[PDB]
Amino acid sequence: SVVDPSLIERIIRDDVRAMGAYHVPDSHGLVKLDAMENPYRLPPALRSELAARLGEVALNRYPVPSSEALRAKLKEVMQVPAGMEVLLGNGSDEIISMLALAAARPGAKVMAPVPGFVMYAMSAQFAGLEFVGVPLRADFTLDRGAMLAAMAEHQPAIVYLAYPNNPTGNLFDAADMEAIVRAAQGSVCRSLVVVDEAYQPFAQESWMSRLTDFGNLLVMRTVSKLGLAGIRLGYVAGDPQWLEQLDKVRPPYNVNVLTEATALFALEHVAVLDEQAAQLRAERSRVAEGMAAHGGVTVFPSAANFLLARVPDAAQTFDRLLARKVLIKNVSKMHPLLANCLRVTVSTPEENAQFLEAFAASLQD
Amino acid sequence: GMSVVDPSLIERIIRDDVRAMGAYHVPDSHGLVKLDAMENYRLPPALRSELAARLGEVSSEALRAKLKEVMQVPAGMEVLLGNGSDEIISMLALAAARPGAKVMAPVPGFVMYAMSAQFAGLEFVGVPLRADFTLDRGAMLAAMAEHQPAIVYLAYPNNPTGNLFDAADMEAIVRAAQGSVCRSLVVVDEAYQPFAQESWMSRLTDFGNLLVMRTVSKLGLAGIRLGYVAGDPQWLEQLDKVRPPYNVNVLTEATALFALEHVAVLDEQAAQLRAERSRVAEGMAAHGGVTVFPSAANFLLARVPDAAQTFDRLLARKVLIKNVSKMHPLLANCLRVTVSTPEENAQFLEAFAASLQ
Numbered sequence: 001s002v003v004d005p006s007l008i009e010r011i012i013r014d015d016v017r018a019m020g021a022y023h024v025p026d027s028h029g030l031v032k033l034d035a036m037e038n039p040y041r042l043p044p045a046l047r048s049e050l051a052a053r054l055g056e057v058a059l060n061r062y063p064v065p066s067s068e069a070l071r072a073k074l075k076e077v078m079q080v081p082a083g084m085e086v087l088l089g090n091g092s093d094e095i096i097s098m099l100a101l102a103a104a105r106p107g108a109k110v111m112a113p114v115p116g117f118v119m120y121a122m123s124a125q126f127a128g129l130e131f132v133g134v135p136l137r138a139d140f141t142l143d144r145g146a147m148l149a150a151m152a153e154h155q156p157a158i159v160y161l162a163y164p165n166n167p168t169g170n171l172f173d174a175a176d177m178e179a180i181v182r183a184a185q186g187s188v189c190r191s192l193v194v195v196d197e198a199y200q201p202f203a204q205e206s207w208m209s210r211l212t213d214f215g216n217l218l219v220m221r222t223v224s225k226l227g228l229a230g231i232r233l234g235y236v237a238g239d240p241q242w243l244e245q246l247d248k249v250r251p252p253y254n255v256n257v258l259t260e261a262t263a264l265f266a267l268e269h270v271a272v273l274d275e276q277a278a279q280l281r282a283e284r285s286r287v288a289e290g291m292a293a294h295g296g297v298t299v300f301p302s303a304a305n306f307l308l309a310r311v312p313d314a315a316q317t318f319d320r321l322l323a324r325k326v327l328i329k330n331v332s333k334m335h336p337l338l339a340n341c342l343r344v345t346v347s348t349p350e351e352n353a354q355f356l357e358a359f360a361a362s363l364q365d
Numbered sequence: 366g367m368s369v370v371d372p373s374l375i376e377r378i379i380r381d382d383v384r385a386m387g388a389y390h391v392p393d394s395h396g397l398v399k400l401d402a403m404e405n406y407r408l409p410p411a412l413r414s415e416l417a418a419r420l421g422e423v424s425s426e427a428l429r430a431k432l433k434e435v436m437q438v439p440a441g442m443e444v445l446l447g448n449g450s451d452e453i454i455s456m457l458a459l460a461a462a463r464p465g466a467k468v469m470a471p472v473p474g475f476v477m478y479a480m481s482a483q484f485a486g487l488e489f490v491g492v493p494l495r496a497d498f499t500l501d502r503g504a505m506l507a508a509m510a511e512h513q514p515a516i517v518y519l520a521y522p523n524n525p526t527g528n529l530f531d532a533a534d535m536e537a538i539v540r541a542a543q544g545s546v547c548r549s550l551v552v553v554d555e556a557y558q559p560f561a562q563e564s565w566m567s568r569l570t571d572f573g574n575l576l577v578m579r580t581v582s583k584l585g586l587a588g589i590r591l592g593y594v595a596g597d598p599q600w601l602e603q604l605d606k607v608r609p610p611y612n613v614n615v616l617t618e619a620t621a622l623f624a625l626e627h628v629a630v631l632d633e634q635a636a637q638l639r640a641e642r643s644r645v646a647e648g649m650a651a652h653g654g655v656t657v658f659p660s661a662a663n664f665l666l667a668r669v670p671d672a673a674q675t676f677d678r679l680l681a682r683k684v685l686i687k688n689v690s691k692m693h694p695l696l697a698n699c700l701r702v703t704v705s706t707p708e709e710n711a712q713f714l715e716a717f718a719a720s721l722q
Binding site: 001002003004005007008010011012013014016017019021022023026035036037051052054055057058059060064067091097101102103104105108121123124125126127128129157158182185186190191192212213214215216225228229230231239241242244245247248249250251252253256257258259 | 366367368369370371372374375377378379380381383384386388389391413416417420421423426441448451458459460461462463466476477480483484485486487515516543544548549550570571572573574586587588589597599600602603605606607608609610611612613614615616617618620
């Protein structure tokens with residue numbers, strides 16, 4: 001090796017080098033419950049129908065998925081209110097970046113609760129805008145007064161609210177959020193408020209209908225990738241006066257055809273996707289109950305496909321789980337309020353049962 | 366009111382220049398011969414069904430191993446996978462997005478070097494190429510000395526100019542970025558390099574601040590090409606920390622593996638490109654006032670008397686090429702034309718000839 005390690009130290013962000021193995025190698029029997037992903041596969045009948053449709057779209061056998069058709073289907077399926085426009089993207093990150101870029105005015109700031117979605121290189125993930133993180137309460141609830149005070153002091157351009165939040169899992173108090181949306185219209189500050197529902201499972205309480213009630217609100221979501229890897233379709237709904245501006249800063253590339261065809265298929269099989277969501281809800285409860293039954297464990301409330309839990313010793317529990325071929329996410333070092341916290345992704349019944357046993361054993365000192 | 370948009374709030378939040386821009390209107394390319402994009406198809410029946418089978422049935426390890434084998438990634442170097450060169454360029458910008466971190470590239474260059482920097486909130490330093498689009502070593506080194514960039518992109522060959530920069534100049538740049546002039550990661554972007562050409566891959570052994578970026582052919586299928594970056598694990602282990610889980614679609618990977626297992630087909634693609642690119646270049650250069658610039662890529666850059674007029678006339682004749690005229694002073698009156706199938710190339714040269722009269 002002819003690498004100069006001091007050059008790597010100089011070029012790569014300290015927070016990127018600080019992080020440990022974001023991806024660990026796929027060994028024999030390793031159960032991964034560390035990533036934002038849905039382990040559930042479709043029924044064989046739907047799997048082969050999707051494989052057929054994507055294969056045909058790949059080989060130019062089936063027709064091109066029209067963006068106008070995909071947007072129209074989203075509006076219908078997602079009950080986008082009358083008068084509101086939908087804008088498509090390559091995942092939620094592109095849409096967040098487009099938003100930040102559209103608002104990249106001299107001195108523009110982005111404000112979001114912390115610990116929150118963008119856990120590293122925040123300003124970088126918000127087109128160079130200054131990031132202002134407002135701590136959530138110790139129990140991860142949104143601190144209305146703290147948000148309002150920071151809003152008054154800092155005068156942000158954009159307020160981002162993850163609904164549910166990553167890594168904490170919780171849906172913030174709806175009243176507190178409405179107060180924030182109204183405050184940002186002028187009385188406290190002047191901001192676009194973006195409710196990010198990217199970690200929200202299908203057929204759940206959405207802010208989509210609140211687009212009718214607030215002129216400074218945008219609601220962003222994603223469509224399932226249906227276990228084929230790749231890029232989830234991202235989308236943002238809101239008033240044409242906001243979206244028409246946002247669409248001018250799109251990167252020099254469109255949304256790829258497989259993502260569009262896959263998202264279309266997802267939208268056309270909502271009954272099946274509702275079934276998965278229900279099965280995951282039942283499994284999340286069993287996993288939460290199992291973890292919660294132990295001494296010194298706090299399982300925090302969750303509306304997501306993952307659970308955050310505080311344990312006596314996260315570093316120790318992580319290693320002991322990995323020693324039993326179970327990989328979860330240690331979020332302990334990402335923020336002071338996440339001290340001794342692990343984030344477990346809800347998986348299949350078989351994998352959940354393996355996690356629960358390994359978790360129970362790892363906690364014994 | 367509470368429920369209605371405040372147009373002064375739009376004015377306060379959204380950039381003045383974005384509001385001044387016209388709306389994004391998606392143009393229909395229906396009925397047009399499209400020679401404005403970075404695409405090559407022509408796959409035979411037997412392979413098309415074999416590929417169809419593979420995609421019907423559908424391991425990143427297996428793909429990563431086959432990439433290293435076929436592309437002869439040097440011993441000790443690893444590969445990181447992504448969605449085209451685009452995702453890799455974005456990941457690099459994010460991983461290197463420290464305060465004051467600058468991205469540098471010779472200009473005119475691929476729009477994503479500057480764009481990736483803008484999206485990551487990083488300054489971009491364009492260093493002009495010479496009027497003939499050759500790399501200016503002296504300019505590059507002075508720029509590096511002055512600005513101290515974090516990343517330097519050296520395309521091989523360059524988009525939209527098509528040419529391969531001087532190898533000695535490039536090596537000088539890579540070595541200067543090790544500490545003598547500045548301290549930068551130098552990425553050789555081989556995304557536009559056809560198969561079976563001179564590559565920087567083997568030089569990963571010689572330079573510790575070098576990464577080599579490439580794509581695999583998608584065999585003319587619709588969608589994304591597999592993109593990958595080869596280099597030392599100490600670099601790639603850090604870049605892997607911003608790679609999203611399951612970032613690449615299984616069909617993208619399947620097609621990439623199918624292509625890496627049918628190298629002879631990639632060789633035949635390369636051979637047909639050499640022939641057709643010579644044909645198109647000659648046909649264009651025959652016209653008075655037309656300068657075709659040298660290329661080792663899937664497209665040709667040409668300067669015409671009036672690019673706006675030639676573009677409109679070609680479009681009126683149902684042929685779409687890329688008007689890069691306004692994208693850099695050095696591209697004044699330049700059009701970038703993608704080399705395609707014999708039939709499409711014939712239609713282009715027919716339309717091009719009629720549009721110049």
